Amino acid sequence: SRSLKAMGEEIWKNKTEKINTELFTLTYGSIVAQLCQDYERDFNKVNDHLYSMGYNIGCRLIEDFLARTALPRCENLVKTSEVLSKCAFKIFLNITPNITNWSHNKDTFSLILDENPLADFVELPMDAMKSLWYSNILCGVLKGSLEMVQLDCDVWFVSDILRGDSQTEIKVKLNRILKDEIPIGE
Amino acid sequence: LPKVSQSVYQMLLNEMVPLAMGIERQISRLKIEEHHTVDIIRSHNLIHELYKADEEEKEKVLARLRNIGFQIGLKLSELLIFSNNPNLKFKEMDLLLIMKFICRDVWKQIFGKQIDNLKTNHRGTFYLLDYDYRPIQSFSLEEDAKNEELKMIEPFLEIPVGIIRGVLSSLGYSSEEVICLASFIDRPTDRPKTAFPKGVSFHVQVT
Amino acid sequence: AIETILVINKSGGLIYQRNFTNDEQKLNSNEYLILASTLHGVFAIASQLTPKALQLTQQTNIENTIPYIPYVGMSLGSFKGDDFFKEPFTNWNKSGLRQLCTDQFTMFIYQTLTGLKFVAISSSVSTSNLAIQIADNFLRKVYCLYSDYVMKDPSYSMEMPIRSNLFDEKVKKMVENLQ
């Protein structure tokens, strides 16, 4: 029909409401701040609860992304990477992640977050400098979305600019393409 | 200036009651992420659990979500004071000007619409009336079980109360003299019938 | 632009799979048997899906008649004249799978009164009724050719696989003009 470029600009410019990114950042910052507050600063597995957060969010966001875009079910890692990089983030967060670090035989790749609106302004405490991720919700949302698109992936964070690394990378390695179900009529 | 999609914001802003209820479970569905088996639980399950848990845990989660909203409002305050630049003072005894600011700018920035008309005691309290209340405009259970709907949808009324409390904080009055309560007692006077039947009222007390 | 045809005798079972494509040959011969039998089964099972609004009250025995497309065929055998027929005719399968439209192709169905089924897969995607009107006429030309060159054949047992050269070359001539 049309290129994913044209689709992303068309959907973003004239088919979605808008708000200030500062306020979204503020809300997510409040969530993470209070999770730190009410949990004795157990950064080892506040990330797990944030992962559950992100999974529950993404599993029900996918119904809206497909509602607007109306793409077919992705089958191969190349098309999944292209769609995630090019329109899936462009609709919601208005960013274009870059893709590098292709693994062997096209089973894994990495999302590079050039600009992260979830962390427009944060300076973590000293104890968090090598424990917390602060953006686990994003990869949780990605996994939850791909679950309903019916392809399982282990997704995790390799690096983050917040902790001190040069760039923020999210490995999204596929595990298996689980198949559609059939009635169990004997 | 940069923007983010209202749909993802509205959904995220809706979904803290499951967060505020499941954090309590962790304090007091198995699957593997990479190597260690984490547990995840749905959102509607936790909404029902909050609906029928017991009184003290319900109150704990209510104060929990009030703290969340307090942080959000207090923290967005300074941004709004910078950007809009109203004509307020630090501790203005004229509560009408503060309430006009909250009605005009804070809600215009959080939700998409200005809040509706407001009462004026001129001595004590104030009332803020909202019609159709954007975040929960698409909530329901059943054709008949409308009585359970309003009691189950209660905790979602706290984050704007927390917003109001926080905005009043860092603008003079602290969180020991001010108290606010939300309710459905507002009735649709003449507006067109939207999905949700009842508008909401925030009763704000300030001595 | 019809790309393939195939015919089912009376109870399932493919008996003709001459594919009218330049060079595709993607589908195995064996799996077309499952294709034809599954189409037969779906034809059978869609019969008991008439909505109850029309189940008890049809009142639509005026649309079953199909108009006469003038020269759908070409430009003969037992037949003679410019065309196999001139008058309009009537539909026979009024509660069965007539069409399956799809982004890349369209499958038309024509059921003979005795029970034979003729299936026409066409790459071309006609308001979904004129397409049926073209397809029914063309498939009945194919049916006339079938009755001419498969029924009046000594070495052909009943409702068995078709193995002939007059029939396949004649239907090839029929389709190469229809595009």
Add this chain to the structure above:
Amino acid sequence: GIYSFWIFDRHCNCIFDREWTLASNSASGTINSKQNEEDAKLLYGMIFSLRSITQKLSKGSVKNDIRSISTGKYRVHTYCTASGLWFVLLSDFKQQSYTQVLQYIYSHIYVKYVSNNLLSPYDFAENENEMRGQGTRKITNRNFISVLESFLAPMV
């Protein structure tokens, strides 16, 4: 206009059912009643079979999906989405297709009263035992039935 309207989910289950009657708008269209369950599994089987045929004998690199299935008495418009959700609608011919209406349904009714409905479930099969299809946990969302009745009332 239309005669019946159906939503099926990933788990090979009927999640929403509706059938109409004579052309009165406020018709006796029994909603989500059990007798419709009998003529629902076979409808799902028919759609699944022809979808399998389409994906089988397709060509190209797009993996096409079936649009409509016409019979003598009516035609079955069907819209599929990548999340394994199928919206099916029976109707007399009377127009080219209802694909725009199905897309509007998915993008303004289901999405905005089942995916923005935090206190209502999704993936209605739960805790094993109904992911194959032997389950009944259909929707009852008052806003959903109300808006769907409102939108589909004129087109009958």
Add this chain to the structure above:
Amino acid sequence: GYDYDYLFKIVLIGDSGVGKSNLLSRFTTDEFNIESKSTIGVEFATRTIEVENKKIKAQIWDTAGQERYRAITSAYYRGAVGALIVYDISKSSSYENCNHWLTELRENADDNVAVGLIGNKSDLAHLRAVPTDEAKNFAMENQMLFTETSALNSDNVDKAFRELIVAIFQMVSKHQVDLGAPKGPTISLTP
């Protein structure tokens, strides 16, 4: 590969829960779509065999109906030429339905249809709920072949299947017999 001369439709009809799904899973050309039993009513198996130089294709349709399939399950026998009545020697209930199954088969399917009768899972010697003697006596009264099968007792179903097809062939095989040009200049003698 349209080399087969004839195509015989045979129904693997039998009672639910009999293990017939595992029965036909052994002898197969298993490829393509599978698990189609619940899709409409049937799943398909095929095989080509050589019968004195006439290649014959078979079509095993495994009809199944649980509670809702009433009309199409009978309609699938429009022109069936063979039947493979499946029962299990574990419970008398499965064998009791054979009379009804044969009655429906003879009523609906082709007149004078070849019918075989296969007893699945004969390895289990702990719950033999019907004797082979009575089964054979029942087989006598209808001119219909009988056999019992097991995983360990292999080749029995295969030989019975081949012998069933070569028996059907003798019934529906019309006899077929395998049925110096003048080269040079020409002169026209037409008037």
